[PDB]
Amino acid sequence: MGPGFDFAQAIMKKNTVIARTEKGEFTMLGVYDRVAVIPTHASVGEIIYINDVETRVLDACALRDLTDTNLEITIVKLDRNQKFRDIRHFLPRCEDDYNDAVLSVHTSKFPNMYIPVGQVTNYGFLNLGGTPTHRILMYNFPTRAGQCGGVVTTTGKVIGIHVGGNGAQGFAAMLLHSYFTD
């Protein structure tokens, strides 16, 4: 409908796949080469389905900060025959608050879904499903089961992936440029 939805759509059309694990279907953001991200609660194993194709997992790393606190991001390298467009230059370098964000989801259940979530707070600590979690972003939208792995963007920035909600608020794990240096 406007420039926020335009940037979100451009990311969804080239940099997402549908990932299936034993714990469900997730929106999965591809970042560069064969490297993608997914919430750690997806429990990635040795094999994953990517757009309903059986795919070997070459590496999976559940990120934690240097306090050894959960970040809820898993970085996955896929045994896929095709690279993602490199979008690392759209990742923030530092922890920050944002205005006018969009949460975008693409699954069997929720295809071509875009949600204007508004203002995003650098919330920090969250007890997420019983697990102490850092670098959480918060937005005042009643997000639901099926939106985990959804991409959070502003115009020109890919800032996080949706990891949970409390019925009134939604929560994303930050994406930082430093996670994807090579």
Swiss-Prot record:
<comment type="function">
    <text>Major viral protease that mediates proteolytic processing of the polyprotein. Cleaves host EIF5B, contributing to host translation shutoff. Also cleaves host PABPC1, contributing to host translation shutoff. Binds and inhibits host IFIH1/MDA5, thereby inhibiting the type-I IFN production and the establishment of the antiviral state. Cleaves host MAP3K7/TAK1, resulting in inhibition of TRAF6-triggered NF-kappa-B induction. Cleaves host TICAM1; this interaction allows the virus to disrupt host TLR3 signaling. Cleaves host IRF7, resulting in inhibition of type-I IFN production.</text>
</comment>
<comment type="subunit">
    <text>Interacts with host IFIH1/MDA5; this interaction inhibits host IFIH1.</text>
</comment>
<feature type="active site" description="For protease 3C activity">
    <location>
        <position position="41"/>
    </location>
</feature>
<feature type="domain" description="Peptidase C3">
    <location>
        <begin position="2"/>
        <end position="180"/>
    </location>
</feature>
<feature type="active site" description="For protease 3C activity">
    <location>
        <position position="72"/>
    </location>
</feature>
<feature type="active site" description="For protease 3C activity">
    <location>
        <position position="148"/>
    </location>
</feature>
<protein>
    <recommendedName>
        <fullName>Protease 3C</fullName>
    </recommendedName>
</protein>
